[PDB]
């Protein structure tokens, strides 16, 4: 709570402050329409005062209002609101600040009146603050407190003495002589709805106390816009309001403290300053040839007077406090007044930039309130402060270099023309060091004229003042730069500065943070530090591979901490993780730096664990890093894994990428069920229009996710009028490996056998045409624990592309190759038990003999069976492989699962439920049987032959199929509808079927058992038992209950029986077959399934309406509520008999090329379900 | 609270316990002025709290579709249409035994006559 | 068997993973694109079973009441109404916070490009 009211008042104090302003200007005379024109007004001079618009003034604000005139039309009309509103809520936060604390010249408050509310304590004291401020007018004054009246005039007359007497203090900040900002100075100040209260009583009493409020205020301050402007491109105006931010202490103590005190410390090893600083990391050890070297460069004495710190983005000035608590200490060790050190430490070792006026002004006022802290004397004498803004240079007076004089002016026509665009680029303009004395010294000039000579000088000189100042700032080298970098990614690139930076910053262009550490090393000077916090997406990727090379190469590692996620106390972020590093500008090989791991824990257990140093590695060289290919920084591998890394020969080209559609999928690709298999490549030779192709999905190896095809006919014509890349043509329909590019949990590959294409979700490898390895052992090296650990090092973010895998090791064995072949070969048969693959060829349970229990423990078997197998396979390869190396690799994650579906971890979750996990395993299984069963009936599958026997298009070639003799153990329907209801009047009852069915396969003798076992079974899971009911009951109300739902959730929305239902009362039910549909089907429908059922319905009701009316009795209600039903049912048939009617007169011809989506929603509302397969509501007659 | 066990054997056996005490308050007699007699015991027989509703229709006893598309509610509520199933179902438990009650009143009244005296 | 105990967040959870697993595989990089990415993460996350749909709407963080009446189902069996109620609860929590993730992608996407390269 004590930030939410800095929260809740800034942005509020923000809005209110631009209202106020913006009404002035409106009542001055300026104003801006809806689209941004200025409305200038013509100023009008009746006479002894002004007419602007239907106001006045006493002539004398002329000139004021011009200048503000001139400003408005040379930037922005919000810009100068900004600046004006944000100038004077700095202003009133200062005087507050300094008045509570007591450092007022005559101790009196003047916001405020101490235990009284809504008062002042200058309006009582008058006669002392008058004198003490404006002596001259201070008679005058008493006479207004006699007035009893004007008390409003003489608060305003008293709080603007103010500002002029801190003028000269803090120059940055207060102006002394007539400016434009008390112009635009809001009116009754005193009144009970003024902007003072909200100051004066919103915010406690007690946050004024710290110095850390004024982070706090620099960072709540701009919250709103900054929410406001982050989803698009950013431009100039809108770069400070996009990334501010404020920083934790103990991150800067820990840059800090490493930087300057480290050299201090080099200097003299025993110093008694090593026990004031807790974050001080000491070196582990070094070998004699790195510490004669260091021994060599080390100096031998340093004066407290020769050291530099650069903060490039001085934004609150959260670093330079701590700077200056090192320096005072290292300058109080040495030995000197106390009343002299704050003074040095200002003048000559503390620098800064920004781009902002508002974070400019913040760090002065800081830096001289952490000054006055500890020193009296101060602020009453003029000290100059080297922290600035950077600004433009657009400007070229005649009266400037020709009135201000009385060789340099090539230096000034020089230096003048690299700021032509400085409110854009920033801190990386680049000065020559050779112009540091000549800018020293016509500063200095600057400086002694800026005192001594007429206006016209004097005018020149505070005009060309900050120019120089700049330059010769940023002209000269410093030995320490810390620095806070702003992010900013692809978003927010401006042309300009996009072009600059890849001009100038080619090998870091990709964002921000990285072109400022390049800098930041081009702008320091020969044994120095730089240390830096940054976001972690430099070291794992390979957009960075340059950065880290040259990287490498040129300078030393020092510490690094690895701070990782949820740090910056969970100011939003989810996805930013951090580093802190510390970096030296000297090389050397053989150093070896220490390394801390804080990625997994919370923002105080970090803190902790860092002040007592957990988790450090520190047994690593430097050049060991440009053994594993990429060179990234993994600081926690072993020697032995790096060394080993490089025995062993890697993959070349063999990995390439697949085609690719420039888009509209739903026109190309189809899942297999859906089509005729006359066309399919795979089966049925002879006319090939779909080809199969690799996509890649979830986690499996070895083989399967063969769900998909794509069009290609004539080697690709309606593909390739697309623009379409269709990369490597040459090497397609051939055998070799796959695995996916974007996963999500590990990496994987798979055998993939001719007649294929891969696309570039699911990368291919070949092997070469007389290559000395084979793909076999390819295959075992890729799905070894070895191969699994090296890609999770070296892309932490699971996108392995093509370039990526294109330096895996090999490793070339004989035994690996049959392993390989075995599991693949287990593999298989695990997946093509199933009807989703078109290698199915038949049921397992069918296949044995005696009772159902008997075939179901026979099945169960054979699974455990294969598990245990590919469970022994796997230990073997290794094994073997952990011998070639002599070193074992942990596991961790999923290193030990099994991918298959005898597996039922993997098929049904990590749950340990295996109480319920063997009751729903049973049901599935007599759920696929039941599913089976109906296959059979359709004519789809046979009991003779083996897999697919018809699936073509509109039932041609059915009848000279049935007349050869494929169906006779068990024969097919003939008209291809299935009737579903819960009555025995048809002969083509699903129920019936299913008992023949149980029959044929499993004998006589035990029929009622089996009937027993399915019945027990299905109420397992699928559905709820009831009280009593025979086993044909329960079967009928799961195959009119939930076998559309579990058919629909098969295929994935993709059926392959249509169903037809009347609608909310299961009147009348169909399936039908989509391979035998064809124009003359509805009408068999309506004649020989509907009229018939009217019939029996209508001669019901005549027939039992009948036998109540005749004889009634106590409980006779029971037929009452049976003859209520019919009646509904008879007009719900009757109202679908009209609508089927009305469809079935136009002949409407499907075509199967076409997918089940589009062809779904052509016969209106008389499926089911069409708004959740076609995504759309079906539409009306 | 939600760890609330309540079956639908209880709800039938207090119905069934509800019906006898009107029946023998009414003093009905005659077997088809027993629609009232069971339309109130069925009334006042569902719970009200959800977690006892969510624990009887998991319970063992009642089904779970509509026999009657006449008593669904015309609600954008969950509740009442589970209520209405609970009581659709009492109704027709309760009425399948309910003449052997009527029956033993009767023969257990007219052992009550005492001459008119 | 009859006992069960599983609640909406675990449901809420699976949702979530299977959104990411969705928006990962099929590359989406547009907003109007996330409804079928959603709707299919709901489809496989209702649970089938009775007994664990009974202890979802017993559960913390799910309302009994529909905010549509364009998605009750015009069915006589209950399951599918408290179905459809998880679908649209859990259509609503995913699409509240579903643009992170899709913004992650596309900025890693922007990250990885590597010049089109
Ligand atoms: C995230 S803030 C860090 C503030 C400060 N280092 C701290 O921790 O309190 C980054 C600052 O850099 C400044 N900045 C942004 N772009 C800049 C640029 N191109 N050149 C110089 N400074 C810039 C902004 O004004 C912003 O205040
Ligand atoms: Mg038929």
Request: negative net charge.
């Amino acid at each position: 709570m004590n930030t939410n009211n800095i929260k809740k008042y800034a942005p509020q104090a923000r809005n209110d402050f631009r209202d106020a302003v913006i009404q002035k200007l409106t009542t001055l005379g300026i104003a801006a329409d809806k689209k941004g024109n200025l409305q200038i007004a013509e100023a009008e001079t009746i006479g002894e005062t002004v007419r602007y618009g239907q106001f006045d003034y006493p002539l004398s604000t002329l000139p004021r209002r011009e200048r503000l005139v001139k400003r408005a039309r040379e930037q922005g009309f919000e810009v100068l609101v900004e600046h004006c509103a944000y100038t004077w809520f700095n202003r009133l936060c200062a005087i507050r600040y300094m008045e509570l604390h007591g450092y007022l010249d005559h101790g009196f408050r003047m916001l405020s009146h101490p235990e009284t509310p809504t008062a002042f304590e200058v309006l009582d004291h008058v006669p002392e603050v008058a004198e003490a401020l404006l002596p001259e007018s201070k008679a005058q004054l008493v006479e207004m407190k006699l007035s009893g009246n004007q008390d409003e005039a003489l608060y305003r007359e008293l709080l603007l003495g103010q500002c002029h007497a801190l003028h000269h203090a803090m120059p940055f900040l207060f102006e002394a002589v007539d400016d434009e900002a008390e112009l635009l100075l809001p009116d009754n100040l005193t009144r009970t709805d003024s902007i003072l209260r909200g100051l004066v009583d919103d915010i406690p009493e007690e946050d004024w106390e710290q110095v850390e409020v004024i982070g706090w205020l620099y960072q709540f301050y701009i919250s709103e816009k900054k929410d406001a402007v982050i989803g698009k491109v950013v431009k100039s105006e809108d770069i400070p309001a996009a990334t501010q931010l404020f920083t934790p202490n103990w991150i800067v103590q820990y840059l800090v403290q490493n930087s300057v005190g480290r050299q201090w410390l080099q200097t003299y090893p025993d110093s008694p300053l090593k026990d004031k600083m807790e974050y001080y990391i000491e070196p582990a050890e070094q070998t004699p040839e790195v510490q004669a070297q260091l021994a060599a460069i080390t100096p031998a004495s340093i004066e407290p007077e020769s050291i530099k710190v650069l903060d490039p983005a001085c934004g609150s000035g959260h670093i330079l406090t701590e700077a200056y608590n090192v320096l005072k200490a290292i300058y109080e060790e040495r030995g000197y007044r106390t009343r002299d050190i704050p003074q040095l430490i200002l003048e000559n070792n503390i620098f800064g930039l920004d781009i902002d006026d508002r974070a400019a002004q913040l760090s002065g006022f800081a830096m001289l309130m952490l000054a006055r802290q500890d020193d009296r004397r101060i602020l009453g004498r003029g000290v100059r402060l080297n922290i600035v803004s950077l600004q433009e240079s657009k400007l070229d007076i005649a009266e400037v270099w020709t009135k201000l004089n009385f060789a340099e002016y090539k230096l000034l026509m020089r230096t003048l023309a690299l700021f032509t665009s400085a409110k854009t680029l920033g801190s990386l303009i680049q000065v020559p060091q050779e112009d540091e004395a000549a800018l020293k010294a016509f500063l200095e000039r600057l400086y002694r004229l800026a005192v001594e000579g007429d206006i016209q000088q004097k005018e020149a000189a505070a005009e060309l003042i900050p120019y120089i100042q700049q330059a010769w700032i940023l002209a000269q080298r410093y030995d320490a730069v810390v620095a806070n970098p702003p992010y900013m990614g692809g978003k927010g690139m401006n042309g300009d500065l996009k072009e600059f930076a890849k001009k100038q910053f080619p090998d870091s262009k990709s964002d921000l943070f990285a072109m400022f550490m390049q800098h930041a090393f081009s702008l320091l000077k020969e044994n120095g530090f730089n240390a830096q916090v940054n976001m972690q997406s430099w070291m794992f990727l390979s957009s960075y591979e340059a950065l880290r090379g040259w990287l490498l190469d040129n300078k030393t590692f020092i510490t690094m901490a690895h701070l990782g996620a949820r740090a910056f106390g969970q100011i939003s972020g989810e996805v930013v993780q951090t580093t802190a590093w510390v970096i030296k500008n000297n090389h050397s090989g053989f150093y070896k730096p220490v390394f801390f791991r804080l990625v997994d824990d919370n923002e105080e257990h970090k803190k902790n664990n860092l002040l007592n140093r957990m988790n450090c590695f520190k047994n690593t060289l430097q050049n060991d890093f440009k053994k594993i290919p990429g060179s990234p920084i993994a600081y926690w591998a072993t020697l032995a894994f790096i060394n080993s890394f490089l025995k062993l020969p890697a993959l070349g080209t063999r990995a390439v990428k697949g085609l690719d559609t420039n888009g509209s999928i739903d026109v190309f690709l189809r899942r297999w069920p859906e089509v005729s298999i006359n066309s399919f490549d795979a089966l049925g030779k002879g006319n090939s229009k779909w080809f199969p192709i690799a996509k890649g999905g979830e986690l499996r190896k070895w083989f399967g996710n063969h769900e998909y095809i794509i069009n290609y006919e004539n080697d690709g014509i309606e593909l390739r009028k697309n623009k379409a890349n269709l990369r490597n043509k040459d090497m397609y329909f051939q055998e070799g490996g796959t695995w996916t590019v974007v996963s999500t949990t590990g990496f994987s590959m798979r055998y993939m056998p001719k007649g294929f294409l891969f696309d570039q979700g699911g990368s291919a490898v070949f092997c070469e045409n007389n290559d000395e390895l084979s793909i076999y052992n390819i295959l075992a090296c890729m799905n070894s624990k070895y191969i699994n650990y090296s890609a999770s090092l070296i892309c932490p973010t699971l996108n392995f592309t093509t370039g990526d895998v294109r330096k895996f090791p090999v490793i070339k064995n004989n035994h690996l190759e049959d392993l390989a072949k075995k599991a693949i070969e287990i593999s298989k048969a695990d997946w093509n038990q199933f009807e989703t693959s078109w290698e199915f060829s038949k049921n397992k349970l069918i296949e044995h003999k005696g009772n159902v229990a008997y075939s179901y423990a026979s099945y169960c078997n054979f699974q455990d069976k294969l598990y245990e197998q590919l469970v022994n396979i796997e230990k073997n390869i290794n094994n073997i492989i952990e011998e070639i190396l002599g070193f074992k690799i942990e596991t961790t994650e999923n290193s030990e699962l099994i991918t298959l579906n005898s597996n039922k971890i993997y098929r049904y979750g990590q749950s340990e439920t295996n109480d319920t996990f063997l009751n729903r395993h049973r049901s599935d299984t007599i759920s696929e049987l039941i599913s089976y069963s109906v296959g059979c009936q359709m004519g789809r599958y046979s009991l003779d032959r083996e897999g697919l026997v018809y699936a073509h298009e509109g039932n041609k070639g059915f009848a000279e199929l049935a007349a050869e003799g494929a169906y006779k153990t068990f024969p097919a329907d003939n008209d291809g509808i299935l009737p579903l209801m819960d009555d025995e009047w048809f002969e083509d009852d699903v129920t019936s079927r299913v008992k023949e069915f149980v029959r044929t396969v499993w004998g006589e003798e035990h029929l009622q058992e089996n009937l027993e076992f399915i019945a027990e079974s299905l109420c397992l899971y699928a559905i709820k038992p009831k009280k009593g009911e025979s086993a044909l009951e329960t079967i009928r109300r799961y195959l009119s209950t939930q076998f559309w739902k579990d058919h629909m959730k098969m295929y994935k929305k993709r059926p392959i029986y249509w169903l037809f239902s009347s609608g909310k009362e299961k009147a009348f039910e169909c399936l039908v077959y989509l391979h035998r549909y064809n124009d003359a089907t509805l009408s068999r429908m309506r004649t020989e399934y509907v009229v018939p059922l009217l019939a029996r319905y209508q001669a019901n009701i005549d027939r039992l309406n009948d036998q109540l009316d005749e004889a009634s009795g106590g409980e006779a209600t029971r037929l009452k509520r049976e003859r209520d039903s019919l009646i509904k049912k008879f007009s719900e048939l009757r109202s679908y008999d009209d609508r089927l009617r009305h469809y079935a007169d136009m002949r409407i011809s499907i075509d199967l090329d076409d997918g089940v989506k589009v062809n779904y929603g052509k016969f209106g509302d008389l499926l089911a379900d069409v708004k959740a397969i076609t995504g759309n509501a079906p539409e009306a007659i | 609270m939600a760890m609330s066990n309540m079956t639908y054997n209880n709800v039938f056996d207090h119905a069934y316990e509800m019906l006898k005490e009107n029946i023998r308050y009414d003093d009905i007699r005659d077997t088809d002025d027993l629609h009232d007699a069971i339309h109130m015991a069925a009334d006042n027989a569902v719970p009200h709290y959800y977690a006892d509703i969510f624990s009887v229709m998991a319970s063992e006893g009642i089904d779970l579709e509509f026999e009657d598309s006449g008593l669904m509610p015309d609600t954008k509520d969950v509740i009442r249409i589970l209520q209405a199933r609970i009581y659709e179902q009492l109704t027709i438990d309760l009425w399948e035994d309910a003449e052997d009650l009527l029956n033993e009143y009767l023969e257990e009244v007219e052992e009550y006559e005492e001459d008119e005296e």
